[PDB]
Amino acid sequence: SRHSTLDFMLGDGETILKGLQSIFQEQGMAESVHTWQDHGYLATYTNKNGSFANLRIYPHGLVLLDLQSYDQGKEEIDSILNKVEERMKELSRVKRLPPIVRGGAIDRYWPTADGRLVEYDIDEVVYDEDSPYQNIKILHSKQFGNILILSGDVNLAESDLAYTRAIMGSGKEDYTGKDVLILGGGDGGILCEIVKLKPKMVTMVEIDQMVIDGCKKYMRKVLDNLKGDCYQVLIEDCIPVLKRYAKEGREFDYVINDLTAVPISTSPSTWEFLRLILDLSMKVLKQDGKYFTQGNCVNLTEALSLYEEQLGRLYCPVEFSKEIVCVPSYLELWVFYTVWKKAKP
Amino acid sequence: GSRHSTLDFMLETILKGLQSIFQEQGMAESVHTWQDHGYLATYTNKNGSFANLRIYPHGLVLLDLQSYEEIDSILNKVEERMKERVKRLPPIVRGGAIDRYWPTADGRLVEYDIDEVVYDEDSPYQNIKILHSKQFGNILILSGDVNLAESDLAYTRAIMGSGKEDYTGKDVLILGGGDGGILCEIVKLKPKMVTMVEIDQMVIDGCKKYMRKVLDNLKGDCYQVLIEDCIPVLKRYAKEGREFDYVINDLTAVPISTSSTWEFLRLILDLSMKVLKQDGKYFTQGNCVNLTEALSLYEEQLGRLYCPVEFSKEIVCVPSYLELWVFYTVWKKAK
Ligand SMILES: CSC[C@H]1O[C@@H](n2cnc3c(N)ncnc32)[C@H](O)[C@@H]1O
Numbered sequence: 035s036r037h038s039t040l041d042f043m044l045g046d047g048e049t050i051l052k053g054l055q056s057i058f059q060e061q062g063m064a065e066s067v068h069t070w071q072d073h074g075y076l077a078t079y080t081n082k083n084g085s086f087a088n089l090r091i092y093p094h095g096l097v098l099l100d101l102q103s104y105d106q107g108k109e110e111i112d113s114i115l116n117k118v119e120e121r122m123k124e125l126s127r128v129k130r131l132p133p134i135v136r137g138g139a140i141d142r143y144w145p146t147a148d149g150r151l152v153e154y155d156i157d158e159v160v161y162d163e164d165s166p167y168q169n170i171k172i173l174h175s176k177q178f179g180n181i182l183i184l185s186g187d188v189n190l191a192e193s194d195l196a197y198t199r200a201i202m203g204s205g206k207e208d209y210t211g212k213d214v215l216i217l218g219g220g221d222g223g224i225l226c227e228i229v230k231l232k233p234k235m236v237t238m239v240e241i242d243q244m245v246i247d248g249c250k251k252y253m254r255k256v257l258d259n260l261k262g263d264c265y266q267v268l269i270e271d272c273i274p275v276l277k278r279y280a281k282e283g284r285e286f287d288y289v290i291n292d293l294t295a296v297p298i299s300t301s302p303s304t305w306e307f308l309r310l311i312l313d314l315s316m317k318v319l320k321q322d323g324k325y326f327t328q329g330n331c332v333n334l335t336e337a338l339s340l341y342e343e344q345l346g347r348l349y350c351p352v353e354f355s356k357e358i359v360c361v362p363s364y365l366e367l368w369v370f371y372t373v374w375k376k377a378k379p
Numbered sequence: 380g381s382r383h384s385t386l387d388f389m390l391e392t393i394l395k396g397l398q399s400i401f402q403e404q405g406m407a408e409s410v411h412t413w414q415d416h417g418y419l420a421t422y423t424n425k426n427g428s429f430a431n432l433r434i435y436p437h438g439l440v441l442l443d444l445q446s447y448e449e450i451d452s453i454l455n456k457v458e459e460r461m462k463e464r465v466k467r468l469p470p471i472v473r474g475g476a477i478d479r480y481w482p483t484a485d486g487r488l489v490e491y492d493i494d495e496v497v498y499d500e501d502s503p504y505q506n507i508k509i510l511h512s513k514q515f516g517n518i519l520i521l522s523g524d525v526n527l528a529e530s531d532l533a534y535t536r537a538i539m540g541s542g543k544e545d546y547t548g549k550d551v552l553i554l555g556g557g558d559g560g561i562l563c564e565i566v567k568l569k570p571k572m573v574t575m576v577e578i579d580q581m582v583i584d585g586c587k588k589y590m591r592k593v594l595d596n597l598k599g600d601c602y603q604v605l606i607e608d609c610i611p612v613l614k615r616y617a618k619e620g621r622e623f624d625y626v627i628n629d630l631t632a633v634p635i636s637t638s639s640t641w642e643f644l645r646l647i648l649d650l651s652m653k654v655l656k657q658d659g660k661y662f663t664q665g666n667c668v669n670l671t672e673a674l675s676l677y678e679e680q681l682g683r684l685y686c687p688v689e690f691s692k693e694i695v696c697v698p699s700y701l702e703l704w705v706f707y708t709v710w711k712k713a714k
């Protein structure tokens with residue numbers, strides 16, 4: 035469960051192999067050696083306590099060491115690593131990344147949307163449950179506070195006021211006396227920030243009661259009650275609700291799409307589904323209102339282009355703008371869209 | 380370099396179930412069995428790649444592969460077969476010509492979107508890297524510590540006191556600041572004078588060329604850059620009784636010395652208060668929010684200067700840092 039690495043960038047393979055072996059030999063470890071017709075050497079060392087090491091010596095001045103614990107055993111590995119560093123100076127760039135914990139009861143590793151390995155300062159699993167719709171985790175970060183992670187995707191931390199600010203239009207909008215629809219938003223951030231501004235009505239449409247309840251319990255920076263003088267939370271799929279509102283001719287001043295990156299469907303195309311949501315949102319948006327949503331990470335330039343393609347395929351002509359926002363817990367810069375109807379004639 | 384891929388299952392019959400995948404790729408197997416601690420199977424390939432399959436006796440199976448598409452396919456096969464509680468983190472490149480991995484001040488592993496080494500030289504004072512990030516632009520890294528990226532105007536704003544200060548007609552001293560960000564931002568605000576004291580000509584030269592979001596000239600109407608150690612210069616200004624409306628400490632985390640880490644920081648703070656107007660303010664970058672002991676040891680030094688001071692702090696999100704950072708504002712107590 036703890037995997038430690040040490041990389042040396044140099045450049046004699048055999049001299050290093052022989053020069054390092056007593057470090058392991060003196061720890062009581064068993065050693066086997068694989069040799070290639072110069073693809074170098076692989077040395078494998080086994081310990082009685084269930085830990086092992088691998089020393090890989092490439093033909094051109096690259097030596098990689100891996101130690102894996104069964105994880106006293108941590109100090110033994112750290113000590114070996116320190117010795118190997120000492121010895122390599124005698125035998126003479128070095129990289130010693132933080133060890134990775136493998137199969138930890140607390141999972142600290144939440145790769146970014148663009149596929150980068152990032153480790154978070156998680157000291158506690160606060161909540162980890164499966165609803166009928168998604169896995170819901172809330173993990174405590176020392177710096178970011180509690181972080182909501184839905185199907186393995188970081189959605190929001192208690193530190194992420196910048197997300198909620200950006201998706202409400204970055205302080206440019208007056209919500210006083212306005213009618214607002216929020217799609218998703220199970221954490222309650224947007225809802226609660228808007229209630230503070232004295233709207234006429236905010237309606238939030240969230241499919242998963244378990245996200246509502248977990249965030250009520252654990253994402254605490256109003257909602258003891260799901261209906262108030264100027265808000266209501268509907269626990270349902272936003273699609274039939276969008277349709278029902280269009281059918282009653284209802285129009286909002288603002289529609290804020292705070293759904294998961296992959297909106298939840300109960301039907302047994304990716305882009306088509308986003309377009310549908312868009313189209314349905316435009317149908318309940320006043321001619322002079324605005325629609326806001328989170329876009330995607332700034333580096334996913336193809337996915338942002340295919341998204342903006344869909345903005346051209348709506349029942350009405352629209353215009354849009356975008357802004358790049360730094361959300362603390364995201365560990366990647368994010369794009370946020372503002373969308374509005376083109377003036378009619 | 381070598382690419383290291385991992386696959387973890389959180390859950391002998393697993394051993395024999397998976398062995399097949401490696402025999403078919405033509406890999407030679409060696410098994411080690413512990414009496415109580417399970418199995419380690421090592422597999423080698425003629426192309427110089429290898430795999431280790433570690434099977435703990437109670438639920439954990441860890442797979443690692445290393446090579447100079449085949450490995451991807453093996454991992455895909457192992458996932459399918461285990462289906463007959465999974466983590467597959469991005470593969471780590473080891474010994475790569477473009478190094479992507481720059482752990483945080485609190486010792487977390489973080490990979491950056493780095494696609495180019497723009498600059499990597501040793502100066503007489505420190506190693507200087509400028510690396511291209513797709514989202515952060517060029518990132519200045521000094522002695523392996525990310526100092527600033529082109530996306531990091533939040534840093535510069537916070538170290539200038541977060542838009543609360545009026546720089547017009549003012550005298551300013553900057554310590555370090557070799558990337559030129561603070562100087563340039565303050566020059567735009569029309570100060571009386573900005574003096575910047577930066578030890579390392581190579582940081583200035585690197586950042587002029589590569590950190591682009593003036594300084595073609597190191598002197599102007601309302602500014603001068605002194606290429607020297609700021610400690611002798613502070614000592615001279617303190618001796619002269621010279622004073623500034625603002626002193627901005629933009630030094631490296633360990634300030635450079637050409638000849639108790641806390642005593643050195645106390646010295647710099649004490650010299651800086653000495654050259655500071657009674658109604659002026661001192662700004663600096665502090666540390667990572669998680670490093671509560673180092674923050675505490677730092678704030679202990681604030682109580683150890685020639686005069687009483689007060690201070691406040693602000694937590695700031697600097698895009699490229701990948702951790703929250705504390706910035707300090709310090710000023711003298713009245714009377
Ligand atoms: C936390 S903000 C993201 C929220 O969007 C919600 N969500 C996803 N799909 C839908 C849907 N079709 N209708 C309503 N809410 C949804 C998720 O349950 C999550 O709470």
Ligand SMILES: CSC[C@H]1O[C@@H](n2cnc3c(N)ncnc32)[C@H](O)[C@@H]1O
Pocket residue numbers: 519521526527554555556557558576577578579582607608609610629630631633634635636
């Ligand atoms: C980029 S901001 C950090 C800057 O502080 C500079 N620096 C570090 N120590 C000193 C010192 N003693 N005097 C002046 N500048 C310094 C470094 O060379 C770097 O350019």
